[PDB]
Structures are given as C-alpha cells and as structure tokens.
Amino acid sequence: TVPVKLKPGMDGPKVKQWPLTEEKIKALVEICTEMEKEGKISKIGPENPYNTPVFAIKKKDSTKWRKLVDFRELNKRTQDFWPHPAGLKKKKSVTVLDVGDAYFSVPLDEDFRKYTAFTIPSINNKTPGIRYQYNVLPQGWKGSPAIFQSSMTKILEPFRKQNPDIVIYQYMDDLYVGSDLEIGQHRTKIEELRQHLLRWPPFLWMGYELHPDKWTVQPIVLPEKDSWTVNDIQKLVGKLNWASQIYPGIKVRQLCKLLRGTKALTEVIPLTEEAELELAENREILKEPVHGVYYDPSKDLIAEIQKQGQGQWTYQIYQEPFKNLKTGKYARTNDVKQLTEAVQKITTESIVIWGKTPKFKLPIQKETWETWWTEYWQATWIPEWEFVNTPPLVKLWYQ
Amino acid sequence: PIETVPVKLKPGMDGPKVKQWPLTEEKIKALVEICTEMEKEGKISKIGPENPYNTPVFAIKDSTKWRKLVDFRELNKRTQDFWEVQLGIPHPAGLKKKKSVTVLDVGDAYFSVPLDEDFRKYTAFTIPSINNKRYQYNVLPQGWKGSPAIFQSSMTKILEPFRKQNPDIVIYQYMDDLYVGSDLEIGQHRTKIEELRQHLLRWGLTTPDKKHQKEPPFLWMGYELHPDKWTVQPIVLPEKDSWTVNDIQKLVGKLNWASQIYPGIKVRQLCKLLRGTKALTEVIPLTEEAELELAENREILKEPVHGVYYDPSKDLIAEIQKQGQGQWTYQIYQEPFKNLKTGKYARMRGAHTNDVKQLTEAVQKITTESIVIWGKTPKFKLPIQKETWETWWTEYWQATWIPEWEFVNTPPLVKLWYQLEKEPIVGAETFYVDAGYVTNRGRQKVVTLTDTTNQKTELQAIYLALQDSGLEVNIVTDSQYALGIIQAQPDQSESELVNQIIEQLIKKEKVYLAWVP
Ligand SMILES: CCOc1ccnc(CCNC(=S)Nc2ccc(C)cn2)c1F
C-alpha cells in the first residue's frame, strides 16, 4: 500500500451526517454488511472521531441501490498527487462508465483508514449508529484514481492500442469513452471495453452517450418585435445596458431618444432610422461570445443556475464575473428533480471539457435541497455547492 | 472480558504532572482506605516512582464516610477527542406502544470496563502519607473525557448478542440507564429482564432487582410516559398579579414546551410584555389581552391530553392550519385525530413573505422533523388549493417541492392577495417615481422626508404612486430593490411601509411595475 497523507497540518474531516429515511438506511445497512463480510470495510471504535456523510442513491434503470459517500471534505484535505485530453470534447459521442468497483482490489494505507470513517445513522436516535472505516481504496476519494492510475494505465494498454480511434478519459470513479464511430458500431466498442474490463462496469447517464460537439453556447438575444411600445424599448435599453458591460460596442444613445419625455407605457413608438441601425448593430455584436475569454486552470469554475419557469432553466459557467466560458439552457418532474438533473448535466459537461467539476450556486433553500437531492441524483461524484437568491433582473436577461 | 479501546494523548502533548494539593490527615486516611480497596478489586494498581505523571485527588463527604473525587481536568485537556456520545434523545412519538417496560440502573459502569493498558500510566495520582518523612487506573475512571464514549461503545457489543437472540425485545441505552421494552406477556417479559441482568452480570455489570426498579409510568426529559400513551409532566401556571420579566420569560418557555402536544397554546400576548424591558426583575402589568391569553392557556392546560405512539404499520398524516398572521399549527396523526404529535411554526424567513412561502416552509420543517423521528415523510393535508400553489410556484425564481399533499377545505384558506400584471396596462396612467413622481397625464408630487434610508425612500415613491393612482396603474421605478420586494408578491412584512403598499396593492384591479436603469 502507498503511504497517502493529509495536506500538511490538516486533520481529518468531522462532517455532520444529514438524517436519512428508513428506506435509505435499510439499503445502506444491507450494502455495508456485504462490504464488511468481504473485508472492504470494518466496524470502528469510539477512538475514531472522524466522519464523512453517506447516502444511498438509486441506480438509473437497475433497481439496485448504490452507496454514495460524500468525501468532499476529506478530498479537499487529501494531499495532491505528483492529464486532460482536449480531444475528448471533439469526439461525436461519449459513453460514461462506472469503473468504481476496481478500487476494491487495492488495500488502503493502514494509517489513513481512520479518515474514511463514515456513519450509518438511525431513526429517532434509537441507537448510536453503525460506524465504519475503509480498508481499501474507497470510491469517491480523490486518492483512489491516483493510487490506481498506474494499474489503470496498464489495464487500458491493449484496448488503447487496439482502438487508438477512441479516446478514454478517467475522472474519479468514471470512465469517459469518446468516439466518432456510428452509434451502433460505438456501443459495440464500448461493450468490448466492458468485457475487457470484466477481464481484470455499469453505464452511467442512461447508458447513453452525451454527443459533445453540439454543446451549444448561448448568446444574449434581443426581442424581435413588429411594433415597439415604450415598455419594450425601456426593457430593451435595460437589457442592452447590462450587456454593455461585457460588449462595449453596444450603444443605446439612439434608442434612448425614442424614450425622451414621460410617455405612457403602452404608447407604440416608431423607431427612427438612426435607432433601427443602432439596434441591428447591437444585434450583430451579440451573435457571438465576447472575445478574449480564456480558461485559466489555476482558477475555479463557477456554474450559476436560474429558474425560468415551465421546466426551463439557464446557467453560466465562468471563472471571472461576466467572462462566460459557456452558457446553456435545460428543459423538462418537479423543480428539484430538474435542478438536480441540470446540475449533474452541467457537471458532466465541465468534466468532459475542462476535466474538473465547477462550484454551483443553486436557487433553492438548503433544507429543501438536502431533503430531496439524493432522490434523483445518479452521478458518483458530488460537486461543491452554495445556495442563493437570484435577482429578478439577472433572470430577466437570459433565454 | 470486554476488549480494550486504544487511547492516546493529543498530538505533541504529554501526560499531566499536577502536584497533589495538601490533604488533611483525616482525608489522607479516608483515601488510603478507598484506594487500598480499589487496588484489591483490580480497578487500580500501585506503581513505581518511574511514573512522573500525576492528577490531584481530593475527598468529599450521605454517611460519615467519604468518596474519592479525582480531578481530571488536565488529562482531559491533553486526551484525544472521541466519537461524541449521542447528543439527541428519541422523541416519544417515535416509539411504538409496548406491554412491559423496565429501566435498569447500571451501577459502577465505568468501573467494570478495562482501560487501555498503555494509557493507565497517565492516570497516575498520589495519596500523601501522614508520616512526615502512587497508583494508576486499570479501568474507565469517573470524570475522564473518554469514559462516556467507551462505556457506551462497550455495552453495545455487550448487548449485541442478547439483542440478536431476542429481536422482539427493544433496548435503549442512555448514560447509565438501560430502558428495555417488549410485547411479551408480563411473566415472560420480567423473566427476559432477568436473563438480561445475567448477561450484563457475566461482564461484572450489576443492576437493581424487580422490587427496587422503576416502572411506568415515568417521567423522562419533561415527558410523562405510559406503555400505551404519552404526554408532558404537570405544568403549573402561577397565579399572581405581579409579573417580572423572568416570570414572563419562564412562563413563555413553559408554554412553548407544552405546544408539542397541547394544541392552541398561545404566547403572542405574553411575549409582547417583554418589549423595551429594562431588567429581569422589572414588573410588567398584564394587559387585557395577555390576561385573556393566560386564562385561555390555563383552560387548555387543566384537562390533560396524551399522544399515542407510532404504529409503523400505518401512514403518517400531517395537517397544517394558519392560526394567525405568521403563525401556523400542525398535528401529525395516523388514525384520524389520534395525535402522535403536534406543534406550531412561527419562523419567518426573510423580511417579507406571503402565506404560500410560509406554508411551504412550514411543510419543509415538518418534513425534516418527521424523517428524523419516523424516518418517512407524512402525507400532508393543506388549507391551500393545488392551482393556487402551482400559480405561485412557477412565478417564483427559487425552486421547491412539496411531497404528497391534498387540499383540505378548512378555512382560513391560504391564497394570494394580488398579482402583478404580466404586461403594462392600456389606458392605465403611467407614474415615473424617483421623493416624488411624474405621470404621463401631467400630474406630479414631491415630498420631503426626515429620518429615512435611501431604499426606504424608494418604497415611499411607489407608495405615493399607488395612493394617488386609480384602480389600474402602471408604475416605473429605478430601484431594483423595491422591484425585488414587490415582485416576490409579499403579503406580510416587518416594515409598515411595505405593509401599507401591500394594502394598496390589494385594492387595485391591475398593477404593473417595471424597472429602468
Ligand atoms: C422512558 C422511555 O424509555 C425509552 C426510550 C427509548 N427507547 C426505549 C425502548 C423502546 N421502547 C419503545 S419502542 N416503546 C416504549 C413505549 C412506552 C414506554 C413507557 C417506553 N418505551 C425506552 F424504553
């Protein structure tokens, strides 16, 4: 076993376990009991004061429960280890695979075990709770894929040469398999991969392929109206003015003249010649993303989501305010289910594109998210997230 | 017998070296008797002067003899943290009913459990000799940081077995007590209780005999528990004409506790008495409404009400009612009107809100509470109609989700009092506000304000506009703040200004509000 260690000075996570439903608890008890019998994990004494929250989640189209451990805190404190194929995104179709189970064949550093302590909670506190710690590389821990890389490299050696036409990327417990073959000749190459891996892995995301060339970006778009009322224009100026921040070439001087004096909101205004040309020019400037926005690896990726209504959502991934790296839409469930699907989708994208998860800003009350997010979550990683209250104006300027 | 838990001192630190303070000869005598005794029972052991560690001891006096009290403050400060013992207690509504119930006191618990051999050296203490010219512990010492944790951890393994051969019996450990409940018939039950005691005994653990045990019903954390029902212990509402801030606070306190079962308890009036109070001992005269409240609480409190237990076979049903502005009451039952537990939610999240948000939030609070006690969410009965909810839902920017729920026609029904137009109104006057306004129809007003705040000035504008405008009115504002607040369609606020606006808003037939930079 490799002697993993925490970042200098840091101690182990002592993270509070969010309460669970009798339903998830049961699953987690069945699962863990099985993991115990196979020595994957072990019961622990009161001399271990660490703790990582655990959750049970449903495997999409599988009927079986999955144990999802939230090692976000541990990971942040796990020493760094000392690459991303910009080609993967270029591929036409990519299938994600859950190679998490590989880890179970590698013992974990004996002195690091205690930090992976986690707890299966109980109803109404009728009993202290089952406490356990990992003996092997645990799924979801930043350390596993690293300590297993070498072995994972060797095991991918053949397929890698037998099919240098498909790119294979690994991120945590997931394998990202990209290709340009045909959806039929592709699913076959993925399967051969599966059979291969079985030699020494469920599909994730519907078993389905993402299709990563179409990841479209999204412009700011101005209304296209027949007649323009004072209101319309006002709103138009407002939006433009905002976008004025990013794209400096935007002008409103000519539109604003149509709004001189205090007219009635519904009064239809004919746009002068000057104005009409200013609009169209503004329109041209908006058809493409502001130039000069580059991804900086040394900076965090932030994803911010807004609720639009009717099952429609908008998001923006950036590193510096206004400097957007990507923007999109997501449409239908129920508010939460959707937001969790959107999150999982935007994450996957970030992973495929920049090889890392973004920090989310979610428009929802913490207590509510904590309550149902695990009901629809299916990914094996867990992004970091904070909770917010989006302004009526920001949303009023997207989609 | 029972396995040892590895203990260690915090990183970098070393055992305690605290000099033993002066002990009278009479005490010095009392200890040597006590300790010499504990050396015979294996609990402690004389050591060689190689051990530079020491923790001060002192004797305390309900007979003529004394008892040894070891001060472990230092050791504790130097000893590693442990997995903290359970902080929370099971709420009765989360228990099932039971035929027999017994509580077993576990004497000298910590005294029967081994202490990590490598750690004992640190528990060294000294007993001064009176002659003018040292031990360590071999078990869990009283007053040591890690004893409540290791003791529990032990008893659990100790119980694990007897727990598997008796899946029908239910055991709950709380400190040094062992509450056991079952559905065996009286005889069999007491007999099992007897086996338990042996099992606990085989590990030197000793308990009280049937005659000296505690049996239902019994208090416990301010509750009054029976094998078939539960409630709260007798709450006495003082009778007097001179109340101090303290009394009022304590009462309010007692009143709150009671509402987890007594529905209808009210404290609004009592609690207004505390406004601007200058001293805990200040006497506040009871106003008429406070007196009316007190008396009403007295009534409710005179004839007790119990809660029934949880029957996992049936569903959990939750019903909520609006008992005043910002006040909600709820009850969770399984059999119609046979309460497991009730409660009231008064929490306001944010300075402004409407009944739809509050309700929803109370729902979330209730859902959370239920998952913790029963491990499932109840099916809700809400005084709100599907459409009303849905209408506010989509129009709100935040996301939320209410589990299974069904409209219950039980006034008052929650509704939205007004809805901002989705588009400007034709023929409705247009007001441009900035403290004053200007309309398209030429009218205008400007007022001066003393004692204000930029953003309050903003709401003021809008206010004026609403006042002087007709039944329909368009309003254009520069304030994104004012926009924000009104957009959220609040029906209740901390501020009176927002509250006046809301009133105005309710009277209109159509209001359109826009923002411009
Ligand atoms: C004083 C309450 O004691 C207990 C607290 C927590 N758990 C238990 C064991 C399980 N008991 C159950 S599920 N039911 C139950 C019913 C009535 C009474 C008076 C005590 N316990 C207890 F007996």
H/E/C letters for each residue in chain A? CCCCCECCCCCCCECCCCCCCHHHHHHHHHHHHHHHHCCCEEECCCCCCCEECEEEEECCCCCCEEEEECCHHHHHHECCCCCCCCCHHHCCEEEEEECHHHHHHCECCCCCHHHHCEEECCHHHCCCCEEEEECECCCCCCHHHHHHHHHHHHHHHHHHHHCCCCEEEEECCEEEEEECCCHHHHHHHHHHHHHHHHHCCCEEEEEEECCCCCCCCCCCCCCCCCCEEHHHHHHHHHHHHHHCCCCCCCCCHHHHHCCCCCCCCCCEECCCHHHHHHHHHHHHHHCCCCCCCCCCCCCCCEEEEEEEECCEEEEEEEEECCEEEEEEEEECCCHHHHHHHHHHHHHHHHHHHHCCCCEEEECECHHHHHHHHHHHCCCCCCCEEEECCCCHHHHCCCC
Q: Is A169 in the same domain as A202?
A: yes
Nearest-angstrom CA–CA distance, A306 and A315: 6
Say which residue the tokens 């472990």 belong to: B72
Q: Sheet harboring A359-362: ordered strands across?
A: A323-331, A312-320, A302-309, A359-362, A384-387
Please tell me if the CB atom of residue B373 comes closer than 6 angstroms to any atom of ligand 1.
Answer: no
Q: Which of B401, B422, B434 to mutate to test the interface with A (most CBs of A within 10 A)?
A: B401
Residues B273, B248 contacting (CB under 8 angstroms): yes
Say which residue the tokens 């940081």 belong to: B145
To test ligand 1's pocket by mutation, which of B86, B97, B101 has the most ligand atoms within 8 angstroms of CB?
A: B101
Residues of A with Cβ-Cβ distance to B88 under 8 angstroms: 125
- The count of structural domains within chain A is 4
Q: Residues with Cβ < 8 Å from B246, sequence gap 6 or more?
A: B280, B281
Residue in A51, A266, A336 closest to B401 by CB: A336
Q: Is A210 in the same domain as A149?
A: yes
The residues facing A43 across adjacent strands are A132
Query: Which helix (H) or strand (E) covers residue B320, if one does?
Result: strand B317-322
- Please choose, from the candidates A284, A74, A91, A77, the residue with its C-alpha nearest in 3D space to the C-alpha of residue A178: A91
B128-136 contacts at long range (C-beta below 8 A, 24 or more positions apart): B128/B20, B128/B22, B128/B23, B128/B28, B129/B28, B130/B25, B130/B28, B130/B29, B134/B46, B134/B47, B134/B49, B134/B51, B134/B54, B135/B35, B135/B38, B135/B39, B135/B44, B135/B45, B135/B46, B135/B47, B136/B44, B136/B45, B136/B47, B136/B51
Nearest-angstrom CA–CA distance, B203 and A103: 41
CB distance from B11 to chain A under 8 Å?
Answer: no
Please tell me if the CB atom of residue B215 comes closer than 6 angstroms to any atom of ligand 1.
Answer: no
Q: Is A195 in the same domain as A321?
A: no
Residues of A with Cβ-Cβ distance to B480 under 8 angstroms: 391-393
Experimental technique behind these coordinates: X-ray
Nearest-angstrom CA–CA distance, B89 and B174: 9
- Domain residues for the domain of A93 are 82-103+145-219
Is the backbone peptide bond immediately before B412 cis, with ω within 30 degrees of 0?
A: yes
Query: Which helix (H) or strand (E) covers residue B69, if one does?
Result: strand B67-70
Q: After which residues does chain A break, using C–N > 2.5 Å?
A: 82, 200, 332
Residues B512, B466 contacting (CB under 8 angstroms): no
Is B177 marked as binding a ligand? Answer: yes
Here the CATH number for the domain that contains residue A58 is: 3.10.10.10
Q: Which of A17, A43, A47 to mutate to test the interface with B (most CBs of B within 10 A)?
A: A47
Nearest-angstrom CA–CA distance, B295 and B191: 49
Please tell me if the CB atom of residue B95 comes closer than 6 angstroms to any atom of ligand 1.
Answer: yes
- Please choose, from the candidates B350, B298, B297, B355, the residue with its C-alpha nearest in 3D space to the C-alpha of residue B325: B355
Say which residue the tokens 């009322």 belong to: A229
Q: Residue B389, SS3?
A: helix
The residue nearest atom 1 of ligand 1, judged by CA position, is B220
- The whole-angstrom distance between residue A279's C-alpha and the CA centroid of its chain comes to 37
Q: Which two tokens stand for residue B446?
A: 């400007």
Residue A258 Cα, gap to closest chain B Cα (Å): 14
Q: Residues with Cβ < 8 Å from B236, sequence gap 6 or more?
A: none
Q: Residue B433, SS3?
A: strand
Residues B481, B412 contacting (CB under 8 angstroms): no
Q: Is A174 in the same domain as A52?
A: no
Q: Is A372 in the same domain as A255?
A: no
Question: What is the longest distance spanned by two Cα atoms in chain A?
Answer: 80
- B97 CA to middle of ligand 1, Å? 8
Domains contained in chain B, CATH given: 1-85+111-147 (3.10.10.10), 86-110+148-216 (3.30.70.270), 217-310 (3.30.70.270), 311-417 (3.30.70.270), 418-514 (3.30.420.10)
CB distance from B2 to chain A under 8 Å?
Answer: no
Q: Residue B224, SS3?
A: strand
**A-B C-beta contacts closer than 8 Å:** 163
- B308 CA to middle of ligand 1, Å? 13
Query: Which helix (H) or strand (E) covers residue B250, if one does?
Result: helix B245-258
Is B434 marked as binding a ligand? Answer: yes
CA angle A340, A344, A349 (to 5 degrees): 145
Residue in B149, B395, B515 closest to A46 by CB: B149
Is A98 marked as binding a ligand? Answer: yes
Residues of A with Cβ-Cβ distance to B474 under 8 angstroms: 264-266
Residues B210, B190 contacting (CB under 8 angstroms): yes
Of the residues A294, A317, A335, which one is the last residue of a structural domain? A294
CB distance from A367 to chain B under 8 Å?
Answer: yes
Interface of A with B in 236-295 (CB under 8 A): 237-238, 241, 262-267
Q: Is A198 in the same domain as A132?
A: no
- The whole-angstrom distance between residue A168's C-alpha and the CA centroid of its chain comes to 19
Of the residues A231, A265, A294, which one is the last residue of a structural domain? A294
CB distance from B513 to chain A under 8 Å?
Answer: no
Q: Is A178 in the same domain as A114?
A: no
Say which residue the tokens 């994104």 belong to: B480
Using the atom order of ligand 1, give the atom closest to the CA of residue B171. Answer: 9
Here the CATH number for the domain that contains residue A162 is: 3.30.70.270
Q: Is A134 in the same domain as A242?
A: no
Residues B178, B170 contacting (CB under 8 angstroms): no
Q: Is A178 in the same domain as A311?
A: no
Is the backbone peptide bond immediately before B167 cis, with ω within 30 degrees of 0?
A: no
Cβ B89–A367 below 8 Å, yes or no?
no
The residue in chain B having the minimum alpha-carbon distance to the alpha carbon of residue A51 is: B83
CA angle B110, B116, B122 (to 5 degrees): 95
Of the residues A186, A219, A252, which one is the last residue of a structural domain? A219
Nearest-angstrom CA–CA distance, B151 and B148: 5
CB distance from B495 to chain A under 8 Å?
Answer: no
Deposited resolution, Å: 3.0
Please tell me if the CB atom of residue B90 comes closer than 6 angstroms to any atom of ligand 1.
Answer: yes
The residue nearest atom 11 of ligand 1, judged by CA position, is B181
DSSP assignment of B92-131: GGGS---SEEEEEE-BTTGGGSB--HHHHGGG-B----SS
- Please choose, from the candidates A54, A60, A63, the residue with its C-alpha nearest in 3D space to the C-alpha of residue A24: A54
**DSSP conformation class of B6:** P
Nearest-angstrom CA–CA distance, B270 and A202: 62
CB distance from B373 to chain A under 8 Å?
Answer: yes
Please tell me if the CB atom of residue B307 comes closer than 6 angstroms to any atom of ligand 1.
Answer: no
The residues facing A302 across adjacent strands are A318, A359
CB distance from B517 to chain A under 8 Å?
Answer: yes
Interface of B with A in 431-490 (CB under 8 A): 432, 438-440, 474, 476, 480, 483-484, 487
CA-atom Rg of chain A in angstroms: 25
Q: Is A124 in the same domain as A112?
A: yes
Angle, in degrees to the nearest 10, between helices A366-376 and B355-373: 60
CB distance from B82 to chain A under 8 Å?
Answer: yes
Please tell me if the CB atom of residue B220 comes closer than 6 angstroms to any atom of ligand 1.
Answer: yes
Count helices and strands in chain B by DSSP H and E runs: 13, 22
Residues A34, A348 contacting (CB under 8 angstroms): no
Q: Is A46 in the same domain as A136?
A: yes
Residue in A25, A263, A310 closest to B440 by CB: A263
Nearest-angstrom CA–CA distance, A390 and A398: 12
Q: Is A128 in the same domain as A37?
A: yes
Interface of A with B in 329-348 (CB under 8 A): 334-339
